[PDB]
Design a protein around this motif. Sequence first.
Motif, PDB file in Angstrom:
ATOM      1  N   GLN A  40     -17.451  -3.760  13.433  1.00 17.12           N
ATOM      2  CA  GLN A  40     -16.659  -2.536  13.472  1.00 17.12           C
ATOM      3  C   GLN A  40     -15.373  -2.682  12.680  1.00 17.12           C
ATOM      4  O   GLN A  40     -14.831  -1.687  12.188  1.00 17.12           O
ATOM      5  CB  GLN A  40     -16.295  -2.167  14.906  1.00 17.12           C
ATOM      6  N   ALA A  41     -14.866  -3.904  12.561  1.00 23.83           N
ATOM      7  CA  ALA A  41     -13.525  -4.149  12.055  1.00 23.83           C
ATOM      8  C   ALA A  41     -13.486  -4.055  10.538  1.00 23.83           C
ATOM      9  O   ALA A  41     -14.250  -4.722   9.839  1.00 23.83           O
ATOM     10  CB  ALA A  41     -13.030  -5.521  12.511  1.00 23.83           C
ATOM     11  N   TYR A  42     -12.573  -3.228  10.036  1.00 22.99           N
ATOM     12  CA  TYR A  42     -12.423  -3.022   8.604  1.00 22.99           C
ATOM     13  C   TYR A  42     -10.986  -3.300   8.187  1.00 22.99           C
ATOM     14  O   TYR A  42     -10.204  -3.822   8.984  1.00 22.99           O
ATOM     15  CB  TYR A  42     -12.856  -1.605   8.215  1.00 22.99           C
ATOM     16  N   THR A  43     -10.629  -2.989   6.944  1.00 25.66           N
ATOM     17  CA  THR A  43      -9.289  -3.264   6.445  1.00 25.66           C
ATOM     18  C   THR A  43      -8.693  -2.004   5.834  1.00 25.66           C
ATOM     19  O   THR A  43      -9.397  -1.213   5.200  1.00 25.66           O
ATOM     20  CB  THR A  43      -9.293  -4.418   5.423  1.00 25.66           C
ATOM     21  N   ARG A  44      -7.394  -1.811   6.059  1.00 26.56           N
ATOM     22  CA  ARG A  44      -6.668  -0.659   5.548  1.00 26.56           C
ATOM     23  C   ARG A  44      -5.281  -1.098   5.101  1.00 26.56           C
ATOM     24  O   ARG A  44      -4.769  -2.134   5.532  1.00 26.56           O
ATOM     25  CB  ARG A  44      -6.558   0.452   6.597  1.00 26.56           C
ATOM     26  N   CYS A  45      -4.678  -0.287   4.232  1.00 25.37           N
ATOM     27  CA  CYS A  45      -3.380  -0.608   3.652  1.00 25.37           C
ATOM     28  C   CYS A  45      -2.317  -0.808   4.723  1.00 25.37           C
ATOM     29  O   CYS A  45      -2.270  -0.087   5.720  1.00 25.37           O
ATOM     30  CB  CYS A  45      -2.963   0.503   2.700  1.00 25.37           C
ATOM     31  N   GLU A  46      -1.452  -1.793   4.507  1.00 25.69           N
ATOM     32  CA  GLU A  46      -0.492  -2.216   5.514  1.00 25.69           C
ATOM     33  C   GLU A  46       0.848  -1.497   5.416  1.00 25.69           C
ATOM     34  O   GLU A  46       1.773  -1.845   6.152  1.00 25.69           O
ATOM     35  CB  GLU A  46      -0.294  -3.732   5.444  1.00 25.69           C
ATOM     36  N   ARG A  47       0.983  -0.511   4.534  1.00 26.90           N
ATOM     37  CA  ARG A  47       2.150   0.362   4.576  1.00 26.90           C
ATOM     38  C   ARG A  47       1.782   1.803   4.878  1.00 26.90           C
ATOM     39  O   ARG A  47       2.345   2.399   5.799  1.00 26.90           O
ATOM     40  CB  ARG A  47       2.949   0.298   3.266  1.00 26.90           C
ATOM     41  N   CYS A  48       0.862   2.385   4.122  1.00 29.31           N
ATOM     42  CA  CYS A  48       0.252   3.660   4.463  1.00 29.31           C
ATOM     43  C   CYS A  48      -1.210   3.393   4.774  1.00 29.31           C
ATOM     44  O   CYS A  48      -1.920   2.824   3.947  1.00 29.31           O
ATOM     45  CB  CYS A  48       0.399   4.673   3.323  1.00 29.31           C
ATOM     46  N   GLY A  49      -1.667   3.802   5.949  1.00 29.54           N
ATOM     47  CA  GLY A  49      -2.945   3.300   6.414  1.00 29.54           C
ATOM     48  C   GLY A  49      -4.158   3.832   5.675  1.00 29.54           C
ATOM     49  O   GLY A  49      -5.135   4.240   6.306  1.00 29.54           O
ATOM     50  N   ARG A  50      -4.121   3.805   4.347  1.00 26.79           N
ATOM     51  CA  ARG A  50      -5.215   4.355   3.554  1.00 26.79           C
ATOM     52  C   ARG A  50      -6.457   3.491   3.716  1.00 26.79           C
ATOM     53  O   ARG A  50      -6.373   2.266   3.578  1.00 26.79           O
ATOM     54  CB  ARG A  50      -4.828   4.443   2.083  1.00 26.79           C
ATOM     55  N   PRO A  51      -7.621   4.083   4.002  1.00 33.52           N
ATOM     56  CA  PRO A  51      -8.798   3.256   4.287  1.00 33.52           C
ATOM     57  C   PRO A  51      -9.409   2.623   3.056  1.00 33.52           C
ATOM     58  O   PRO A  51      -9.785   1.446   3.099  1.00 33.52           O
ATOM     59  CB  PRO A  51      -9.754   4.250   4.948  1.00 33.52           C
ATOM     60  N   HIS A  52      -9.528   3.362   1.962  1.00 29.58           N
ATOM     61  CA  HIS A  52     -10.260   2.881   0.805  1.00 29.58           C
ATOM     62  C   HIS A  52      -9.364   2.063  -0.112  1.00 29.58           C
ATOM     63  O   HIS A  52      -8.144   2.217  -0.117  1.00 29.58           O
ATOM     64  CB  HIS A  52     -10.859   4.049   0.031  1.00 29.58           C
ATOM     65  N   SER A  53      -9.992   1.178  -0.886  1.00 24.71           N
ATOM     66  CA  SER A  53      -9.354   0.455  -1.988  1.00 24.71           C
ATOM     67  C   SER A  53      -8.127  -0.326  -1.513  1.00 24.71           C
ATOM     68  O   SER A  53      -6.989  -0.020  -1.850  1.00 24.71           O
ATOM     69  CB  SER A  53      -8.995   1.407  -3.136  1.00 24.71           C
ATOM     70  N   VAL A  54      -8.394  -1.347  -0.707  1.00 25.00           N
ATOM     71  CA  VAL A  54      -7.356  -2.254  -0.233  1.00 25.00           C
ATOM     72  C   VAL A  54      -7.638  -3.650  -0.771  1.00 25.00           C
ATOM     73  O   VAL A  54      -8.642  -4.270  -0.406  1.00 25.00           O
ATOM     74  CB  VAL A  54      -7.271  -2.261   1.295  1.00 25.00           C
ATOM     75  N   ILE A  55      -6.740  -4.148  -1.618  1.00 27.39           N
ATOM     76  CA  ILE A  55      -6.901  -5.438  -2.279  1.00 27.39           C
ATOM     77  C   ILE A  55      -6.418  -6.541  -1.351  1.00 27.39           C
ATOM     78  O   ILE A  55      -5.232  -6.597  -1.012  1.00 27.39           O
ATOM     79  CB  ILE A  55      -6.144  -5.475  -3.613  1.00 27.39           C
ATOM     80  N   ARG A  56      -7.331  -7.450  -0.982  1.00 26.06           N
ATOM     81  CA  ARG A  56      -7.094  -8.348   0.149  1.00 26.06           C
ATOM     82  C   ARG A  56      -6.000  -9.369  -0.128  1.00 26.06           C
ATOM     83  O   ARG A  56      -5.351  -9.840   0.808  1.00 26.06           O
ATOM     84  CB  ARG A  56      -8.388  -9.059   0.537  1.00 26.06           C
ATOM     85  N   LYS A  57      -5.783  -9.738  -1.390  1.00 23.67           N
ATOM     86  CA  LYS A  57      -4.716 -10.684  -1.685  1.00 23.67           C
ATOM     87  C   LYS A  57      -3.348 -10.095  -1.410  1.00 23.67           C
ATOM     88  O   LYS A  57      -2.386 -10.845  -1.234  1.00 23.67           O
ATOM     89  CB  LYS A  57      -4.793 -11.144  -3.141  1.00 23.67           C
ATOM     90  N   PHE A  58      -3.245  -8.770  -1.376  1.00 29.53           N
ATOM     91  CA  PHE A  58      -1.994  -8.083  -1.098  1.00 29.53           C
ATOM     92  C   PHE A  58      -1.996  -7.321   0.216  1.00 29.53           C
ATOM     93  O   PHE A  58      -0.935  -7.173   0.825  1.00 29.53           O
ATOM     94  CB  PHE A  58      -1.660  -7.104  -2.233  1.00 29.53           C
TER      95      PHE A  58
END
Lengths: 123, 114, 96, 74, 147, 60
Positions: F18-36
């Motif tokens: 279930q667990a996904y990744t989202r941007c850590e300033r604005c919680g945008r779901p798509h296109s999150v670069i993991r190194k940043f």
Amino acid sequence: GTGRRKSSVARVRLVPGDGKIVINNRDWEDYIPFAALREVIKQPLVATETLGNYDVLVNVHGGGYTGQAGAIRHGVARALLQVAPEYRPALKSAGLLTRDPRMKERKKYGLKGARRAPQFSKR
Amino acid sequence: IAGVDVPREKRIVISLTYIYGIGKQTAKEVLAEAGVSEDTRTRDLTEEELGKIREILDRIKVEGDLRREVNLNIKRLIEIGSYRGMRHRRGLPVRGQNTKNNARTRKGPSKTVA
Amino acid sequence: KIRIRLKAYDHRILDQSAEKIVETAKRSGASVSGPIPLPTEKSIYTVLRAVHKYKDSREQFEMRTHKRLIDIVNPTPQTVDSLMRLDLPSGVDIEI
Amino acid sequence: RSLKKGPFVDDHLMKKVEAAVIKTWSRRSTIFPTFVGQTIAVYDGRKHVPVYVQEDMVGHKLGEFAPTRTYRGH
Amino acid sequence: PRKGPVAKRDVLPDPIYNSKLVTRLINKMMVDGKRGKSQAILYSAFDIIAQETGKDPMEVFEQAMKNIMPLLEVKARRVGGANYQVPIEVRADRRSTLGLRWLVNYARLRGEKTMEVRVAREIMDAANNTGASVKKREDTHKMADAN
Amino acid sequence: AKKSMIAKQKRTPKYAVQAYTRCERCGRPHSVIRKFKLCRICFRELAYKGQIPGVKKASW
RNA sequence: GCGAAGAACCUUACCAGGUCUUGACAUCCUUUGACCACUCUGGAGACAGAGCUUUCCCGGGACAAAGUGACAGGUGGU
RNA sequence: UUAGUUGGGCACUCUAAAGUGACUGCCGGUGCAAGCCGGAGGAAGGUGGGGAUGACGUCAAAUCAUCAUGCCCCUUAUGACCUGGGCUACACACGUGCUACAAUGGAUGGUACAAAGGGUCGCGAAGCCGCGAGGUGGAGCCAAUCCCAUAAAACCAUUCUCAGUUCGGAUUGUAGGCUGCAACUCGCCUACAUGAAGCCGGAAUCGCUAGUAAUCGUGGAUCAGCAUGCCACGGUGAAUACGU
Ligand SMILES: [Mg+2]
Ligand SMILES: [Mg+2]
Ligand SMILES: [Mg+2]
Ligand SMILES: [Mg+2]
Ligand SMILES: [Mg+2]
Ligand SMILES: [Mg+2]
Ligand SMILES: [Mg+2]
Ligand SMILES: [Mg+2]
Ligand SMILES: [Mg+2]
Ligand SMILES: [Mg+2]
Ligand SMILES: [Mg+2]
Ligand SMILES: [Mg+2]
Ligand SMILES: [Mg+2]
Ligand SMILES: [Mg+2]
Ligand SMILES: [Mg+2]
Ligand SMILES: [Mg+2]
Ligand SMILES: [Mg+2]
Ligand SMILES: [Mg+2]
Ligand SMILES: [Mg+2]
Ligand SMILES: [Mg+2]
Ligand SMILES: [Mg+2]
Ligand SMILES: [Mg+2]
Ligand SMILES: [Mg+2]
Ligand SMILES: [Mg+2]
Ligand SMILES: [Mg+2]
Ligand SMILES: [Mg+2]
Ligand SMILES: [Mg+2]
Ligand SMILES: [Mg+2]
Ligand SMILES: [Mg+2]
Ligand SMILES: [Mg+2]
Ligand SMILES: [Mg+2]
Ligand SMILES: [Mg+2]
Ligand SMILES: [Mg+2]
Ligand SMILES: [Mg+2]
Ligand SMILES: [Mg+2]
Ligand SMILES: [Mg+2]
Ligand SMILES: [Zn+2]
């Protein structure tokens, strides 16, 4: 000697001898099957009359099979000329000391290839 | 000749593919079990060998017998009530292949513009 | 017989810093394996320009990592004492 | 699991069927060889389509029988 | 180009029988970077054309030069708000370029099994002042003859 | 129904999937670069100002 | 071959059914203190019921639980 | 030494910091001059090739669905929690790609040459079980060292001999592998079987001026898993420009 073309490099040591043009610790006809493309390698040795007078040693890294053929030609053409400066007045005219400057091209975003582009339809 | 009119001018391995059940990897072995060299011409097959092939070819299934099992299993799905059967009768791909566009191996030809 | 590895983003800051310890190495010991280059890593991030559609406009950033390593051949007691007593510009990477 | 090292029902459909109409809520819980003769109700996104697990339809995922899109001609 | 003329290159003398009518027709042979496929074929066609014909392969290959080189290319001239057929005299560009195009564009008409002989038969066929490549040249001058 | 879901990204679910990744300033779901951990639009907007070290514009 | 540099679930903004009200999520306050985590039953889970239970630190301090509101909360519109 | 393996040396390559080099500089014609036509020399000749860089402003152009915001509306619901489902539906029409319609090819065996990237809670070797996708095992590595990782087109021999075929591979049955609590609606792959249209595409229409188009492979981002797409990297390498 030292001669580049495309992504391949060939470093040549030239010493007087029988004329066996060895390449990369193997016989050249073993290493190149289509001998008809290997005759141009004798252009740096037929434009100046030194065809079978030196045994050519070569070291090869990279490129493709035709990719070294342009580099070994140049890679010796800069050594036979260094043997005696008399060879430059004809090796610098046939197009042998020149280094082919064409190389593959970056792929730019928005384009399928380097210079190609999507297909276009109006309406 | 054997079961059906297997091609005459072809080889042994190539022509023995001419049944519904004998293909390429199965044929390369059923011709090997008979012992005939795979390059032997079918029109010159050994009469000492054509009697050998029927021994092996009697073991595996063949055209007229096995093909009833292809229809029997593909008819059990429709009667069982399974969703896979529905797409058999209607004419749509049984798998998840999408029917929105570009799926015509099943739905006959490209129907008239309607 | 030590080895120090330098990993900084700007070639000016590290190559200057390495030019300092390589000098301090000579004073500590004549036998010094001076600065030497290694191929530099490059990475590219092709982020898309528009907030919404227009798929053909993007912008590419990069991030290098210039590398250099320094070693010791026949060191002396000064090497262990006189190495750790230095602070380099913030960005230079130290690992002995 | 399509691997031969496994065969799973949901957590409880087997338990309720073990003692025992049946209305197992979700889906996905292929009818093993211990449920022929006990009709279940596999939900369909709305309503509960009734299917009677016979001996033939054994092994198949419970869901298959109940369709989800209603397409009664073009 | 909307600015003046340009001059072309097409020049790399081949290994065997060094010439540029044999590195050309060897470049108008390949498809998708297949220099090796063509080069062997273009030397095996000489091998069969040097045996079944007897004479020199180069002279036999150049024997079909005057039988394929066009003389009048009907130009599409814009007169009266449309395009017509105004014949003109082709230059050296559309002579050798057209001329060596005629063969390969007619390599589906030799009707052999392999391109080793098919290109070898057509050169001889035109070298006999027969075949289709020369007929194609005579066909072009025919439509140029009407205008 | 947006600021509710950032709590859904944050809380540990009942299945790793279930667990996904989202941007850590604005919680945008798509296109999150993991190194940043930044989305595409956050990442560029900081690079210009220059918060991200090392990153610079790449002519080539 | 467009936002979507990854729609089984999640993501999901949509439908059906089932559930919550100061709210799942912040800041103002009070009574408790570090609150959790764990096993058993039911359920589709969301959630209910039982137990050991969470041994704070230096009057003050971080974090939490429970009690009504100011409020929150809107990928609702231009 | 079976191997660049070992001593040993930075000679050549190559890596990467500071520099040189090309500017119509020289010669001939022409021009008044700007410049234009040609020649030497030089690795490179006429801004050498390619990137980044986008003035004043136009379209009331796109986005309130990245973030923020004027004003309005809902505020025991137009807010919130779960399970299932839709986002993949099909009688059809249009856009962009993939694979072919075969001999410059298929099938079988041998066999040769890359560039650029990624790896710590990650890359995961050798051997072993397998036709099989894979499983067990754990070497070496915080990497110019070890791993991902045997690149394929090319080439050399035999067979096929112009057939809807020894091409093509959709479609379907059975049997299997991987991840994941779970692959039915709805994932990827393997074996056997099955074997369909297609025999170079109507009026019309698209891209590209040279390492370009065409064609064959590889890597990364997102990512438990899934790409014929996207962003990058190389190998083979053409045709024509009279003219507006
Ligand atoms: Mg010189
Ligand atoms: Mg362009
Ligand atoms: Mg699908
Ligand atoms: Mg159609
Ligand atoms: Mg721009
Ligand atoms: Mg319809
Ligand atoms: Mg996921
Ligand atoms: Mg879309
Ligand atoms: Mg040196
Ligand atoms: Mg000049
Ligand atoms: Mg330039
Ligand atoms: Mg430029
Ligand atoms: Mg630009
Ligand atoms: Mg305006
Ligand atoms: Mg506006
Ligand atoms: Mg508009
Ligand atoms: Mg909106
Ligand atoms: Mg903002
Ligand atoms: Mg902001
Ligand atoms: Mg969609
Ligand atoms: Mg889809
Ligand atoms: Mg189309
Ligand atoms: Mg072909
Ligand atoms: Mg093929
Ligand atoms: Mg590399
Ligand atoms: Mg391949
Ligand atoms: Mg091929
Ligand atoms: Mg085939
Ligand atoms: Mg079929
Ligand atoms: Mg079928
Ligand atoms: Mg058949
Ligand atoms: Mg077939
Ligand atoms: Mg069919
Ligand atoms: Mg242009
Ligand atoms: Mg990256
Ligand atoms: Mg897509
Ligand atoms: Zn963001």
